[PDB]
């Protein structure tokens, strides 16, 4: 009876937090079990802070941003917002809000204030592990990557400008450590990976020949693989780094991929038009479908002798 308003994973992929109109619930991703539920009216886009007791959500009733403490069951703070919220991120340090044409940054903890002038952008942004990445406001195929320095004069700060694509950037995904950015355009024809230190192109992958729009991308826990889903509705897995190159070994002849090592064609009802991807393990995956309130579990298999990979769908589970 309860539709899903918004849904997201906590930073490490261990939990799924969803808001319905009547409430918001937190589920354990795998195996899938409801950890808790809380009655809330009109909760909007909603986010989680790790496994901690703090939860952010945007009131669909008002312009408010609620910072909710689950221990004492109250709002520690409410934050006035000037526009609609496109995106939201939490760290034990900062609160990052994408509202309308701008990105606002707030201190996490008293006095919950705005610690830098709003950053104007082109609609696309991501914040993970102290690292901010956002579309440029004028050229939409260009991204800015910058560390947020909490202790410095001068929390801005510095920054690198990468021209990621010709067409405007569709989406952006940081890996866990934060040293790599997966990058996407409206074309969805090809995926790029940049080093966040210098913004240099690390790798380029080809998803397909035809243009499609890309729903989600997520990095494997160990940072070796990247999962991508298109609206053509096939799951792709790319190997960005094999074992040796990931562990930073010396490569005997380095001086001398481009395609997925895996596909799975997903069967999608006419209804569900968006989803999100999580890595259960180095070899596991889960796709979450809001419309169906459904979670599909995928197994990534490797044939040792032929050095080939294949995807398997193990399970499907309603939320509820």
PDB file of C-alpha atoms in Angstrom:
ATOM      1  CA  UNK A   1       0.000   0.000   0.000  1.00  0.00           C
ATOM      2  CA  UNK A   2       3.032   2.255   0.587  1.00  0.00           C
ATOM      3  CA  UNK A   3       4.734   3.819  -2.455  1.00  0.00           C
ATOM      4  CA  UNK A   4       8.457   4.647  -2.349  1.00  0.00           C
ATOM      5  CA  UNK A   5       9.153   8.375  -2.446  1.00  0.00           C
ATOM      6  CA  UNK A   6      12.952   8.319  -2.249  1.00  0.00           C
ATOM      7  CA  UNK A   7      15.622   5.664  -1.631  1.00  0.00           C
ATOM      8  CA  UNK A   8      19.406   5.505  -1.166  1.00  0.00           C
ATOM      9  CA  UNK A   9      22.296   3.367   0.097  1.00  0.00           C
ATOM     10  CA  UNK A  10      24.545   4.425   2.950  1.00  0.00           C
ATOM     11  CA  UNK A  11      28.125   5.149   1.871  1.00  0.00           C
ATOM     12  CA  UNK A  12      29.427   1.588   2.341  1.00  0.00           C
ATOM     13  CA  UNK A  13      26.457  -0.124   0.659  1.00  0.00           C
ATOM     14  CA  UNK A  14      25.501  -2.037   3.818  1.00  0.00           C
ATOM     15  CA  UNK A  15      22.088  -0.394   4.226  1.00  0.00           C
ATOM     16  CA  UNK A  16      19.171   0.882   2.180  1.00  0.00           C
ATOM     17  CA  UNK A  17      17.097   3.779   3.453  1.00  0.00           C
ATOM     18  CA  UNK A  18      13.736   4.543   1.886  1.00  0.00           C
ATOM     19  CA  UNK A  19      11.028   7.078   2.603  1.00  0.00           C
ATOM     20  CA  UNK A  20       7.359   6.405   2.023  1.00  0.00           C
ATOM     21  CA  UNK A  21       4.667   9.043   2.453  1.00  0.00           C
ATOM     22  CA  UNK A  22       3.750   7.579   5.853  1.00  0.00           C
ATOM     23  CA  UNK A  23       7.264   6.744   7.072  1.00  0.00           C
ATOM     24  CA  UNK A  24      10.914   6.007   6.458  1.00  0.00           C
ATOM     25  CA  UNK A  25      12.503   2.600   6.872  1.00  0.00           C
ATOM     26  CA  UNK A  26      16.028   1.243   6.991  1.00  0.00           C
ATOM     27  CA  UNK A  27      16.809  -2.165   5.543  1.00  0.00           C
ATOM     28  CA  UNK A  28      19.865  -4.364   5.716  1.00  0.00           C
ATOM     29  CA  UNK A  29      20.880  -4.792   2.094  1.00  0.00           C
ATOM     30  CA  UNK A  30      22.125  -8.358   2.204  1.00  0.00           C
ATOM     31  CA  UNK A  31      20.662 -10.503   3.331  1.00  0.00           C
ATOM     32  CA  UNK A  32      17.624  -8.250   3.015  1.00  0.00           C
ATOM     33  CA  UNK A  33      15.926  -7.524   6.359  1.00  0.00           C
ATOM     34  CA  UNK A  34      14.131  -4.439   7.692  1.00  0.00           C
ATOM     35  CA  UNK A  35      16.318  -3.052  10.466  1.00  0.00           C
ATOM     36  CA  UNK A  36      13.965  -0.305  11.548  1.00  0.00           C
ATOM     37  CA  UNK A  37      10.949   1.825  10.734  1.00  0.00           C
ATOM     38  CA  UNK A  38       9.916   5.330  11.791  1.00  0.00           C
ATOM     39  CA  UNK A  39       6.624   7.094  11.153  1.00  0.00           C
ATOM     40  CA  UNK A  40       7.214  10.406   9.422  1.00  0.00           C
ATOM     41  CA  UNK A  41       4.850  12.653   7.452  1.00  0.00           C
ATOM     42  CA  UNK A  42       6.014  13.999   4.098  1.00  0.00           C
ATOM     43  CA  UNK A  43       9.657  12.926   4.083  1.00  0.00           C
ATOM     44  CA  UNK A  44      11.344  13.874   0.827  1.00  0.00           C
ATOM     45  CA  UNK A  45      14.684  12.808  -0.535  1.00  0.00           C
ATOM     46  CA  UNK A  46      16.367  11.034   2.377  1.00  0.00           C
ATOM     47  CA  UNK A  47      19.949  10.145   3.324  1.00  0.00           C
ATOM     48  CA  UNK A  48      21.789   8.160   5.960  1.00  0.00           C
ATOM     49  CA  UNK A  49      25.089   8.577   7.769  1.00  0.00           C
ATOM     50  CA  UNK A  50      26.909   5.252   7.718  1.00  0.00           C
ATOM     51  CA  UNK A  51      25.380   3.057  10.403  1.00  0.00           C
ATOM     52  CA  UNK A  52      25.225   6.003  12.826  1.00  0.00           C
ATOM     53  CA  UNK A  53      22.179   7.496  14.550  1.00  0.00           C
ATOM     54  CA  UNK A  54      21.863  10.540  12.273  1.00  0.00           C
ATOM     55  CA  UNK A  55      19.563  10.674   9.275  1.00  0.00           C
ATOM     56  CA  UNK A  56      18.847  13.585   6.950  1.00  0.00           C
ATOM     57  CA  UNK A  57      15.641  14.151   5.019  1.00  0.00           C
ATOM     58  CA  UNK A  58      14.017  16.971   3.089  1.00  0.00           C
ATOM     59  CA  UNK A  59      10.470  17.865   4.071  1.00  0.00           C
ATOM     60  CA  UNK A  60       8.085  17.413   1.141  1.00  0.00           C
ATOM     61  CA  UNK A  61       5.705  19.574   3.159  1.00  0.00           C
ATOM     62  CA  UNK A  62       8.089  22.538   3.543  1.00  0.00           C
ATOM     63  CA  UNK A  63      11.404  24.061   2.397  1.00  0.00           C
ATOM     64  CA  UNK A  64      13.022  22.481   5.465  1.00  0.00           C
ATOM     65  CA  UNK A  65      15.952  20.105   5.747  1.00  0.00           C
ATOM     66  CA  UNK A  66      15.532  17.871   8.798  1.00  0.00           C
ATOM     67  CA  UNK A  67      18.548  16.497  10.642  1.00  0.00           C
ATOM     68  CA  UNK A  68      17.093  13.640  12.647  1.00  0.00           C
ATOM     69  CA  UNK A  69      18.683  11.987  15.655  1.00  0.00           C
ATOM     70  CA  UNK A  70      17.274   8.509  16.194  1.00  0.00           C
ATOM     71  CA  UNK A  71      18.576   8.098  19.740  1.00  0.00           C
ATOM     72  CA  UNK A  72      16.428  10.863  21.251  1.00  0.00           C
ATOM     73  CA  UNK A  73      13.873  10.732  18.445  1.00  0.00           C
ATOM     74  CA  UNK A  74      13.913  14.428  17.470  1.00  0.00           C
ATOM     75  CA  UNK A  75      15.318  16.961  14.994  1.00  0.00           C
ATOM     76  CA  UNK A  76      18.692  18.248  16.191  1.00  0.00           C
ATOM     77  CA  UNK A  77      18.307  20.924  13.557  1.00  0.00           C
ATOM     78  CA  UNK A  78      16.181  22.126  10.689  1.00  0.00           C
ATOM     79  CA  UNK A  79      17.893  23.953   7.835  1.00  0.00           C
ATOM     80  CA  UNK A  80      16.168  26.557   5.679  1.00  0.00           C
ATOM     81  CA  UNK A  81      16.442  25.856   1.941  1.00  0.00           C
ATOM     82  CA  UNK A  82      16.071  28.328  -0.913  1.00  0.00           C
ATOM     83  CA  UNK A  83      15.032  25.890  -3.654  1.00  0.00           C
ATOM     84  CA  UNK A  84      14.164  22.309  -4.556  1.00  0.00           C
ATOM     85  CA  UNK A  85      16.741  19.720  -3.533  1.00  0.00           C
ATOM     86  CA  UNK A  86      18.176  17.676  -6.387  1.00  0.00           C
ATOM     87  CA  UNK A  87      20.779  15.887  -4.275  1.00  0.00           C
ATOM     88  CA  UNK A  88      22.073  15.368  -0.750  1.00  0.00           C
ATOM     89  CA  UNK A  89      25.189  14.003   0.982  1.00  0.00           C
ATOM     90  CA  UNK A  90      26.393  13.552   4.568  1.00  0.00           C
ATOM     91  CA  UNK A  91      29.750  13.162   6.286  1.00  0.00           C
ATOM     92  CA  UNK A  92      30.696  13.408   9.961  1.00  0.00           C
ATOM     93  CA  UNK A  93      32.075  16.806   8.899  1.00  0.00           C
ATOM     94  CA  UNK A  94      29.960  18.419   6.155  1.00  0.00           C
ATOM     95  CA  UNK A  95      26.417  18.432   4.790  1.00  0.00           C
ATOM     96  CA  UNK A  96      26.248  18.906   1.024  1.00  0.00           C
ATOM     97  CA  UNK A  97      23.038  20.014  -0.647  1.00  0.00           C
ATOM     98  CA  UNK A  98      22.271  20.351  -4.333  1.00  0.00           C
ATOM     99  CA  UNK A  99      19.353  22.744  -4.585  1.00  0.00           C
ATOM    100  CA  UNK A 100      18.231  24.308  -7.838  1.00  0.00           C
ATOM    101  CA  UNK A 101      21.199  25.814  -9.647  1.00  0.00           C
ATOM    102  CA  UNK A 102      23.534  25.713  -6.669  1.00  0.00           C
ATOM    103  CA  UNK A 103      25.488  23.576  -4.200  1.00  0.00           C
ATOM    104  CA  UNK A 104      25.413  24.593  -0.537  1.00  0.00           C
ATOM    105  CA  UNK A 105      27.767  23.369   2.176  1.00  0.00           C
ATOM    106  CA  UNK A 106      26.904  23.271   5.876  1.00  0.00           C
ATOM    107  CA  UNK A 107      28.917  22.407   8.958  1.00  0.00           C
ATOM    108  CA  UNK A 108      27.738  19.119  10.413  1.00  0.00           C
ATOM    109  CA  UNK A 109      27.337  19.855  14.107  1.00  0.00           C
ATOM    110  CA  UNK A 110      26.749  23.157  15.890  1.00  0.00           C
ATOM    111  CA  UNK A 111      25.994  25.639  14.742  1.00  0.00           C
ATOM    112  CA  UNK A 112      24.859  23.850  11.547  1.00  0.00           C
ATOM    113  CA  UNK A 113      25.791  26.883   9.444  1.00  0.00           C
ATOM    114  CA  UNK A 114      26.829  27.531   5.848  1.00  0.00           C
ATOM    115  CA  UNK A 115      30.622  27.367   5.748  1.00  0.00           C
ATOM    116  CA  UNK A 116      31.094  28.506   2.158  1.00  0.00           C
ATOM    117  CA  UNK A 117      29.437  30.579  -0.518  1.00  0.00           C
ATOM    118  CA  UNK A 118      27.039  28.585  -2.649  1.00  0.00           C
ATOM    119  CA  UNK A 119      28.798  26.912  -5.576  1.00  0.00           C
ATOM    120  CA  UNK A 120      27.013  27.399  -8.899  1.00  0.00           C
ATOM    121  CA  UNK A 121      26.960  24.300 -11.110  1.00  0.00           C
ATOM    122  CA  UNK A 122      25.457  22.539 -14.124  1.00  0.00           C
ATOM    123  CA  UNK A 123      23.122  20.109 -12.382  1.00  0.00           C
ATOM    124  CA  UNK A 124      25.408  17.119 -11.801  1.00  0.00           C
ATOM    125  CA  UNK A 125      27.285  16.469  -8.578  1.00  0.00           C
ATOM    126  CA  UNK A 126      28.601  13.837  -6.182  1.00  0.00           C
ATOM    127  CA  UNK A 127      30.263  13.964  -2.772  1.00  0.00           C
ATOM    128  CA  UNK A 128      32.130  11.069  -1.192  1.00  0.00           C
ATOM    129  CA  UNK A 129      34.949  10.773   1.327  1.00  0.00           C
ATOM    130  CA  UNK A 130      35.652  14.511   1.533  1.00  0.00           C
ATOM    131  CA  UNK A 131      35.747  14.886  -2.220  1.00  0.00           C
ATOM    132  CA  UNK A 132      33.323  17.044  -4.208  1.00  0.00           C
ATOM    133  CA  UNK A 133      32.707  16.663  -7.933  1.00  0.00           C
ATOM    134  CA  UNK A 134      30.313  18.783  -9.970  1.00  0.00           C
ATOM    135  CA  UNK A 135      29.263  19.728 -13.482  1.00  0.00           C
ATOM    136  CA  UNK A 136      30.400  23.191 -14.601  1.00  0.00           C
ATOM    137  CA  UNK A 137      27.534  25.675 -14.982  1.00  0.00           C
ATOM    138  CA  UNK A 138      28.462  26.868 -18.471  1.00  0.00           C
ATOM    139  CA  UNK A 139      30.197  23.937 -20.160  1.00  0.00           C
ATOM    140  CA  UNK A 140      28.166  20.915 -19.109  1.00  0.00           C
ATOM    141  CA  UNK A 141      30.636  18.257 -20.240  1.00  0.00           C
ATOM    142  CA  UNK A 142      33.220  19.575 -17.800  1.00  0.00           C
ATOM    143  CA  UNK A 143      33.578  18.668 -14.143  1.00  0.00           C
ATOM    144  CA  UNK A 144      35.249  20.170 -11.101  1.00  0.00           C
ATOM    145  CA  UNK A 145      36.966  17.967  -8.559  1.00  0.00           C
ATOM    146  CA  UNK A 146      38.006  19.447  -5.234  1.00  0.00           C
ATOM    147  CA  UNK A 147      38.780  18.310  -1.701  1.00  0.00           C
ATOM    148  CA  UNK A 148      36.847  20.028   1.050  1.00  0.00           C
ATOM    149  CA  UNK A 149      39.427  21.143   3.568  1.00  0.00           C
ATOM    150  CA  UNK A 150      37.732  21.540   6.939  1.00  0.00           C
ATOM    151  CA  UNK A 151      40.749  22.967   8.730  1.00  0.00           C
ATOM    152  CA  UNK A 152      42.217  25.530   6.397  1.00  0.00           C
ATOM    153  CA  UNK A 153      41.380  29.185   5.902  1.00  0.00           C
ATOM    154  CA  UNK A 154      40.247  28.545   3.036  1.00  0.00           C
ATOM    155  CA  UNK A 155      37.888  25.645   2.909  1.00  0.00           C
ATOM    156  CA  UNK A 156      36.976  25.973  -0.740  1.00  0.00           C
ATOM    157  CA  UNK A 157      39.234  24.741  -2.107  1.00  0.00           C
ATOM    158  CA  UNK A 158      41.947  24.532  -4.787  1.00  0.00           C
ATOM    159  CA  UNK A 159      40.377  22.303  -7.439  1.00  0.00           C
ATOM    160  CA  UNK A 160      40.816  20.713 -10.860  1.00  0.00           C
ATOM    161  CA  UNK A 161      38.822  21.233 -14.070  1.00  0.00           C
ATOM    162  CA  UNK A 162      38.435  18.164 -16.278  1.00  0.00           C
ATOM    163  CA  UNK A 163      36.763  18.241 -19.657  1.00  0.00           C
ATOM    164  CA  UNK A 164      35.077  14.887 -19.307  1.00  0.00           C
ATOM    165  CA  UNK A 165      32.833  14.722 -22.350  1.00  0.00           C
ATOM    166  CA  UNK A 166      31.727  16.408 -25.548  1.00  0.00           C
ATOM    167  CA  UNK A 167      28.041  16.105 -24.730  1.00  0.00           C
ATOM    168  CA  UNK A 168      26.892  17.163 -21.262  1.00  0.00           C
ATOM    169  CA  UNK A 169      27.689  14.859 -18.347  1.00  0.00           C
ATOM    170  CA  UNK A 170      24.812  12.530 -17.445  1.00  0.00           C
ATOM    171  CA  UNK A 171      26.174  11.297 -14.097  1.00  0.00           C
ATOM    172  CA  UNK A 172      29.266  10.848 -11.933  1.00  0.00           C
ATOM    173  CA  UNK A 173      30.384   8.129  -9.498  1.00  0.00           C
ATOM    174  CA  UNK A 174      33.279   8.167  -7.024  1.00  0.00           C
ATOM    175  CA  UNK A 175      34.857   4.892  -5.926  1.00  0.00           C
ATOM    176  CA  UNK A 176      35.139   4.059  -2.234  1.00  0.00           C
ATOM    177  CA  UNK A 177      38.595   5.527  -1.487  1.00  0.00           C
ATOM    178  CA  UNK A 178      37.724   8.510  -3.662  1.00  0.00           C
ATOM    179  CA  UNK A 179      40.742   8.368  -5.984  1.00  0.00           C
ATOM    180  CA  UNK A 180      38.730   7.568  -9.123  1.00  0.00           C
ATOM    181  CA  UNK A 181      35.725   9.118 -10.858  1.00  0.00           C
ATOM    182  CA  UNK A 182      33.485   7.207 -13.249  1.00  0.00           C
ATOM    183  CA  UNK A 183      31.985   9.557 -15.786  1.00  0.00           C
ATOM    184  CA  UNK A 184      29.037   9.517 -18.104  1.00  0.00           C
ATOM    185  CA  UNK A 185      27.361  11.690 -20.741  1.00  0.00           C
ATOM    186  CA  UNK A 186      23.884  12.051 -22.240  1.00  0.00           C
ATOM    187  CA  UNK A 187      25.149   9.751 -24.967  1.00  0.00           C
ATOM    188  CA  UNK A 188      25.847   6.938 -22.524  1.00  0.00           C
ATOM    189  CA  UNK A 189      27.866   5.551 -25.380  1.00  0.00           C
ATOM    190  CA  UNK A 190      31.110   5.617 -23.412  1.00  0.00           C
ATOM    191  CA  UNK A 191      32.293   5.727 -19.802  1.00  0.00           C
ATOM    192  CA  UNK A 192      35.458   7.413 -18.564  1.00  0.00           C
ATOM    193  CA  UNK A 193      37.570   7.066 -15.425  1.00  0.00           C
ATOM    194  CA  UNK A 194      39.682   9.923 -14.082  1.00  0.00           C
ATOM    195  CA  UNK A 195      42.201  10.150 -11.240  1.00  0.00           C
ATOM    196  CA  UNK A 196      40.932  12.676  -8.701  1.00  0.00           C
ATOM    197  CA  UNK A 197      44.354  14.042  -7.724  1.00  0.00           C
ATOM    198  CA  UNK A 198      45.131  15.529 -11.133  1.00  0.00           C
ATOM    199  CA  UNK A 199      41.932  14.798 -13.038  1.00  0.00           C
ATOM    200  CA  UNK A 200      43.892  12.788 -15.634  1.00  0.00           C
ATOM    201  CA  UNK A 201      42.104  10.192 -17.756  1.00  0.00           C
ATOM    202  CA  UNK A 202      42.805   6.745 -16.400  1.00  0.00           C
ATOM    203  CA  UNK A 203      40.608   4.568 -18.597  1.00  0.00           C
ATOM    204  CA  UNK A 204      37.887   4.703 -21.241  1.00  0.00           C
ATOM    205  CA  UNK A 205      35.246   2.020 -21.718  1.00  0.00           C
ATOM    206  CA  UNK A 206      32.641   1.509 -24.414  1.00  0.00           C
ATOM    207  CA  UNK A 207      29.192   0.509 -23.185  1.00  0.00           C
ATOM    208  CA  UNK A 208      27.684   0.049 -26.636  1.00  0.00           C
ATOM    209  CA  UNK A 209      27.269   1.380 -30.160  1.00  0.00           C
ATOM    210  CA  UNK A 210      23.852   3.028 -29.737  1.00  0.00           C
ATOM    211  CA  UNK A 211      23.086   6.047 -27.549  1.00  0.00           C
ATOM    212  CA  UNK A 212      21.302   5.249 -24.280  1.00  0.00           C
ATOM    213  CA  UNK A 213      20.781   6.959 -20.951  1.00  0.00           C
ATOM    214  CA  UNK A 214      22.592   5.573 -17.926  1.00  0.00           C
ATOM    215  CA  UNK A 215      20.571   4.926 -14.766  1.00  0.00           C
ATOM    216  CA  UNK A 216      23.332   4.055 -12.284  1.00  0.00           C
ATOM    217  CA  UNK A 217      27.026   3.214 -11.871  1.00  0.00           C
ATOM    218  CA  UNK A 218      28.670   1.736  -8.769  1.00  0.00           C
ATOM    219  CA  UNK A 219      32.257   0.667  -7.990  1.00  0.00           C
ATOM    220  CA  UNK A 220      33.106  -2.739  -6.546  1.00  0.00           C
ATOM    221  CA  UNK A 221      34.197  -2.688  -2.890  1.00  0.00           C
ATOM    222  CA  UNK A 222      37.849  -3.261  -3.815  1.00  0.00           C
ATOM    223  CA  UNK A 223      37.764  -0.690  -6.608  1.00  0.00           C
ATOM    224  CA  UNK A 224      38.675  -3.171  -9.334  1.00  0.00           C
ATOM    225  CA  UNK A 225      35.316  -3.271 -11.107  1.00  0.00           C
ATOM    226  CA  UNK A 226      32.587  -0.857 -12.179  1.00  0.00           C
ATOM    227  CA  UNK A 227      28.953  -1.841 -12.611  1.00  0.00           C
ATOM    228  CA  UNK A 228      26.804   0.180 -14.992  1.00  0.00           C
ATOM    229  CA  UNK A 229      23.126   0.055 -15.960  1.00  0.00           C
ATOM    230  CA  UNK A 230      21.560   1.634 -19.052  1.00  0.00           C
ATOM    231  CA  UNK A 231      17.932   2.183 -19.976  1.00  0.00           C
ATOM    232  CA  UNK A 232      18.477  -0.370 -22.731  1.00  0.00           C
ATOM    233  CA  UNK A 233      18.155  -2.389 -19.539  1.00  0.00           C
ATOM    234  CA  UNK A 234      21.317  -4.443 -19.549  1.00  0.00           C
ATOM    235  CA  UNK A 235      23.769  -4.636 -16.653  1.00  0.00           C
ATOM    236  CA  UNK A 236      27.408  -4.203 -17.662  1.00  0.00           C
ATOM    237  CA  UNK A 237      30.484  -4.935 -15.580  1.00  0.00           C
ATOM    238  CA  UNK A 238      33.840  -3.406 -16.531  1.00  0.00           C
ATOM    239  CA  UNK A 239      37.193  -4.405 -15.080  1.00  0.00           C
ATOM    240  CA  UNK A 240      39.099  -1.179 -14.493  1.00  0.00           C
ATOM    241  CA  UNK A 241      42.049  -2.798 -12.729  1.00  0.00           C
ATOM    242  CA  UNK A 242      43.138  -6.423 -12.683  1.00  0.00           C
ATOM    243  CA  UNK A 243      44.791  -7.770  -9.538  1.00  0.00           C
ATOM    244  CA  UNK A 244      48.353  -6.625 -10.285  1.00  0.00           C
ATOM    245  CA  UNK A 245      47.541  -3.085 -11.406  1.00  0.00           C
ATOM    246  CA  UNK A 246      45.136  -2.597  -8.498  1.00  0.00           C
ATOM    247  CA  UNK A 247      47.734  -3.581  -5.898  1.00  0.00           C
ATOM    248  CA  UNK A 248      50.159  -1.114  -7.465  1.00  0.00           C
ATOM    249  CA  UNK A 249      52.765  -3.669  -8.512  1.00  0.00           C
ATOM    250  CA  UNK A 250      55.508  -3.115 -11.064  1.00  0.00           C
ATOM    251  CA  UNK A 251      54.327  -4.136 -14.521  1.00  0.00           C
ATOM    252  CA  UNK A 252      57.071  -5.675 -16.666  1.00  0.00           C
ATOM    253  CA  UNK A 253      56.002  -4.304 -20.032  1.00  0.00           C
ATOM    254  CA  UNK A 254      53.540  -1.545 -19.375  1.00  0.00           C
ATOM    255  CA  UNK A 255      55.010   0.279 -22.358  1.00  0.00           C
ATOM    256  CA  UNK A 256      54.081  -1.306 -25.696  1.00  0.00           C
ATOM    257  CA  UNK A 257      39.723  -3.630 -22.087  1.00  0.00           C
ATOM    258  CA  UNK A 258      37.429  -0.979 -23.571  1.00  0.00           C
ATOM    259  CA  UNK A 259      34.459  -3.337 -23.228  1.00  0.00           C
ATOM    260  CA  UNK A 260      32.468  -4.979 -20.474  1.00  0.00           C
ATOM    261  CA  UNK A 261      33.639  -8.363 -19.246  1.00  0.00           C
ATOM    262  CA  UNK A 262      29.954  -9.012 -18.457  1.00  0.00           C
ATOM    263  CA  UNK A 263      26.405  -8.310 -19.561  1.00  0.00           C
ATOM    264  CA  UNK A 264      23.059  -9.360 -18.247  1.00  0.00           C
ATOM    265  CA  UNK A 265      19.911  -8.380 -20.099  1.00  0.00           C
ATOM    266  CA  UNK A 266      17.462  -7.411 -17.377  1.00  0.00           C
ATOM    267  CA  UNK A 267      13.746  -8.008 -17.804  1.00  0.00           C
ATOM    268  CA  UNK A 268      11.987  -4.826 -16.696  1.00  0.00           C
ATOM    269  CA  UNK A 269       8.219  -4.368 -16.390  1.00  0.00           C
ATOM    270  CA  UNK A 270       6.748  -1.442 -18.331  1.00  0.00           C
ATOM    271  CA  UNK A 271       6.436   0.236 -14.940  1.00  0.00           C
ATOM    272  CA  UNK A 272       9.890   0.522 -13.400  1.00  0.00           C
ATOM    273  CA  UNK A 273      11.953   3.318 -14.995  1.00  0.00           C
ATOM    274  CA  UNK A 274      14.796   3.826 -12.441  1.00  0.00           C
ATOM    275  CA  UNK A 275      16.940   1.709 -10.109  1.00  0.00           C
ATOM    276  CA  UNK A 276      20.120   1.673  -8.011  1.00  0.00           C
ATOM    277  CA  UNK A 277      23.091  -0.667  -7.758  1.00  0.00           C
ATOM    278  CA  UNK A 278      24.949  -1.944  -4.707  1.00  0.00           C
ATOM    279  CA  UNK A 279      27.894  -4.307  -4.302  1.00  0.00           C
ATOM    280  CA  UNK A 280      27.212  -6.980  -1.682  1.00  0.00           C
ATOM    281  CA  UNK A 281      30.755  -8.280  -1.968  1.00  0.00           C
ATOM    282  CA  UNK A 282      33.649  -8.258  -4.386  1.00  0.00           C
ATOM    283  CA  UNK A 283      31.623 -10.798  -6.385  1.00  0.00           C
ATOM    284  CA  UNK A 284      28.045  -9.822  -5.398  1.00  0.00           C
ATOM    285  CA  UNK A 285      25.483  -7.283  -6.637  1.00  0.00           C
ATOM    286  CA  UNK A 286      21.997  -6.040  -5.908  1.00  0.00           C
ATOM    287  CA  UNK A 287      19.683  -3.980  -8.041  1.00  0.00           C
ATOM    288  CA  UNK A 288      16.924  -2.067  -6.295  1.00  0.00           C
ATOM    289  CA  UNK A 289      13.748  -1.169  -8.177  1.00  0.00           C
ATOM    290  CA  UNK A 290      11.568   1.474  -6.488  1.00  0.00           C
ATOM    291  CA  UNK A 291       8.361   0.869  -8.465  1.00  0.00           C
ATOM    292  CA  UNK A 292       8.193  -2.840  -7.756  1.00  0.00           C
ATOM    293  CA  UNK A 293       9.774  -2.515  -4.332  1.00  0.00           C
ATOM    294  CA  UNK A 294      12.095  -5.279  -5.496  1.00  0.00           C
ATOM    295  CA  UNK A 295      15.699  -6.361  -4.967  1.00  0.00           C
ATOM    296  CA  UNK A 296      17.516  -8.616  -7.446  1.00  0.00           C
ATOM    297  CA  UNK A 297      20.665 -10.419  -6.345  1.00  0.00           C
ATOM    298  CA  UNK A 298      23.392 -11.062  -8.935  1.00  0.00           C
ATOM    299  CA  UNK A 299      26.383 -13.392  -8.789  1.00  0.00           C
ATOM    300  CA  UNK A 300      29.543 -12.477 -10.675  1.00  0.00           C
ATOM    301  CA  UNK A 301      31.280 -15.669 -11.742  1.00  0.00           C
ATOM    302  CA  UNK A 302      34.805 -16.213 -13.047  1.00  0.00           C
ATOM    303  CA  UNK A 303      36.060 -19.125 -15.107  1.00  0.00           C
ATOM    304  CA  UNK A 304      39.666 -19.550 -14.061  1.00  0.00           C
ATOM    305  CA  UNK A 305      40.936 -21.519 -17.063  1.00  0.00           C
ATOM    306  CA  UNK A 306      39.281 -19.475 -19.809  1.00  0.00           C
ATOM    307  CA  UNK A 307      39.713 -16.161 -17.958  1.00  0.00           C
ATOM    308  CA  UNK A 308      36.105 -15.182 -18.614  1.00  0.00           C
ATOM    309  CA  UNK A 309      33.284 -13.788 -16.469  1.00  0.00           C
ATOM    310  CA  UNK A 310      29.531 -14.259 -16.450  1.00  0.00           C
ATOM    311  CA  UNK A 311      26.572 -12.865 -14.520  1.00  0.00           C
ATOM    312  CA  UNK A 312      23.901 -14.907 -12.792  1.00  0.00           C
ATOM    313  CA  UNK A 313      20.657 -13.819 -11.165  1.00  0.00           C
ATOM    314  CA  UNK A 314      20.365 -15.718  -7.879  1.00  0.00           C
ATOM    315  CA  UNK A 315      17.303 -14.207  -6.244  1.00  0.00           C
ATOM    316  CA  UNK A 316      14.512 -11.646  -6.190  1.00  0.00           C
ATOM    317  CA  UNK A 317      12.973 -10.243  -3.001  1.00  0.00           C
ATOM    318  CA  UNK A 318      10.178  -7.759  -2.305  1.00  0.00           C
ATOM    319  CA  UNK A 319      11.055  -5.150   0.327  1.00  0.00           C
ATOM    320  CA  UNK A 320       8.186  -4.583   1.544  1.00  0.00           C
TER     321      UNK A 320
END
